[PDB]
């Protein structure tokens, strides 16, 4: 059974763990959001053949630049996450994450993933962003960054409502099935 290694990277607090739990349990952790997501194996069917989608979280390792890369070897696809309601996490995509996975895994494809899209409609959240001259990141802005950083695609989701959630991993499976290719300048 072939294995597809998928590693979720991104700033702390962008919902990496929550996103993985929501996708594997099919229900948002209503009462208490777990802190830990252990390496998970999800059987998925490709060409009528069973594959193992291996999911790896990195929550907690964001501040350690020497421990953090230990999870990268033999990754088939990365999910570079940033919260659509956190401009700083979006800036780190460009300044920190992509540069890093690009260095360690040159031929490994990655998707730009915007999380917590449900918060674009959360009063409290938008108000806080307001008291700082900030607004949520728009899909258009994210699609441009994805294009400029040679990400396979830009996808966004909500762990809460699961909107776009399954599609994020479908796209990750598709990108991983691609043959070893050098970063390409996508169109659009």
């Amino acid at each position: 059974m072939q294995t597809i290694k998928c590693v979720v990277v991104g700033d702390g607090a962008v919902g990496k763990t929550c996103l993985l739990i929501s996708y594997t349990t099919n229900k948002f952790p209503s009462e208490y959001v777990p802190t830990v997501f252990d390496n998970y194996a999800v059987t998925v069917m490709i060409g009528g053949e069973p594959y193992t989608l291996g999911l790896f979280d990195t929550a907690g390792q964001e501040d350690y630049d020497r421990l953090r890369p230990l999870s990268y070897p033999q990754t088939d696809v990365f999910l570079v996450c940033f919260s659509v309601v956190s401009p700083s996490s979006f800036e780190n995509v460009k300044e920190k994450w992509v540069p890093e996975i690009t260095h360690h895994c040159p031929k490994t494809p990655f998707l730009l993933v915007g999380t917590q899209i449900d918060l674009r409609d959360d009063p409290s959240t938008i108000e806080k962003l307001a008291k700082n001259k900030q607004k949520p990141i728009t899909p258009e802005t994210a699609e441009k960054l994805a294009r400029d950083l040679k990400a396979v695609k830009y996808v966004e989701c909500s762990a809460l409502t699961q909107k776009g959630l399954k599609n994020v991993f479908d796209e990750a499976i598709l990108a991983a099935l691609e043959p070893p290719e050098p970063k390409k300048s996508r169109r659009s």
């Binding site: 390496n39 350690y64 260095h103």
Partner: protein, 337 residues
């Protein structure tokens, strides 16, 4: 009532802490027996080469020691906090020294990785995996120790969040800071062991206090430089000196992506001075030598990092001042004639 809620939320963190500790222990064990012990099984000897068998300690590092510690001490101690989760902080504080074993495992991890890059395909492994009915490879389990030490901080921060009014909130905050302290020390040391070209014992420089990459300008007294365009240097702040190294992002074969650092120079702390504020940039500070006859304008990536470095350097300079003070006081008492 808010009290009841927080108490309930405290219970959830304890459950997760305890459930994840157990899975962690069982997982280290299934791999220690399903792979490590299997390298010495005659019935298997025909699938593994002797080269691999001798590199067992490199593949698993001190996982067994870690397993034993958690499976004989820590798990048992966490279980004794169930009835009162807020006291779990004390639990960590009492074993801080024991966690030092994670440094060994983390420093060896990249080494193990290099080995796995060449024998991951080996029939021995593919076989052990089938016997275990595992869908994830061995290296994925080899990451668990690294993943585990970097969750405790998250769990403690969570417990603390639901224990602000509990008798024991202080121990939680100290346990969190201590755990963050060990994670910092381990991470810092990964940079240290990557220094090359250093003639001498790095251990004689005293404890490593800080490390980081910086843009650096030189403003040395009249009579490598970086007058206008900053140069890139990775600095290592030790109790007795500041080491400057050049990041060697260059690779070779079997590409280890972790960069190494070529030692360039060393500034003795006895003649080091500092300048906290620089014109035009809040994230700049200066480290000068021999009363400014040599000056390094350091630009930190963030103001917070700059502050962290200034404070750490000042603690060191302060202790240096007191040490001399004490010294010139004892030999000053020599007025006994």
């Amino acid at each position: 009532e808010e009290e009841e809620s927080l108490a309930i939320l405290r219970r959830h963190v304890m459950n997760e802490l305890l459930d994840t500790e157990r899975a962690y222990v069982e997982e280290l064990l299934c791999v220690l027996e399903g792979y490590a012990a299997e390298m010495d099984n005659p019935l298997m000897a025909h699938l593994i080469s002797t080269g691999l068998q001798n590199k067992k300690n490199i593949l698993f590092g001190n996982m067994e020691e870690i397993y034993h510690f958690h499976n004989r001490i820590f798990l048992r101690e966490l279980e004794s906090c169930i009835d009162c989760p807020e006291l779990v902080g004390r639990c960590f504080l009492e074993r801080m020294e024991e966690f030092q074993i994670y440094e060994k495992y983390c420093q060896n991890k990249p080494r193990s990785e290099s080995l796995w890059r060449q024998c991951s395909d080996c029939p021995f492994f593919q076989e052990c995996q089938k016997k275990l009915d595992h869908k994830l490879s061995l290296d994925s389990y080899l990451l668990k120790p690294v993943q585990r030490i970097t969750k405790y901080q998250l769990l403690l921060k969570e417990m603390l969040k639901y224990s602000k009014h509990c008798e024991g909130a202080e121990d939680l905050q100290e346990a969190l800071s201590s755990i963050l302290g060990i994670l910092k020390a381990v991470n810092d040391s990964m940079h240290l062991i990557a220094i090359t070209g250093y003639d001498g014992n790095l251990g004689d420089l005293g404890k490593l206090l800080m490390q980081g990459s910086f843009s650096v300008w030189t403003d040395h007294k009249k009579g490598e430089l970086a007058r206008f365009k900053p140069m890139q240097r990775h600095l290592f702040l030790h109790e007795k000196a500041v080491l400057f190294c050049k990041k060697r992002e260059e690779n070779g074969e079997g590409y280890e992506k972790a960069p190494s650092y070529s030692y360039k120079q060393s500034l003795n702390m006895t003649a080091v001075g500092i300048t906290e504020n620089v014109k035009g940039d809040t994230k700049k500070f200066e480290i000068w030598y021999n009363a400014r006859e040599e000056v390094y304008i350091i630009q930190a990536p963030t103001p917070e990092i700059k502050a962290a470095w200034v404070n750490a350097i000042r603690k060191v300079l302060t202790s240096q001042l007191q040490a001399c003070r004490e010294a010139s006081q004892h030999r000053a008492l020599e007025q006994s004639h």
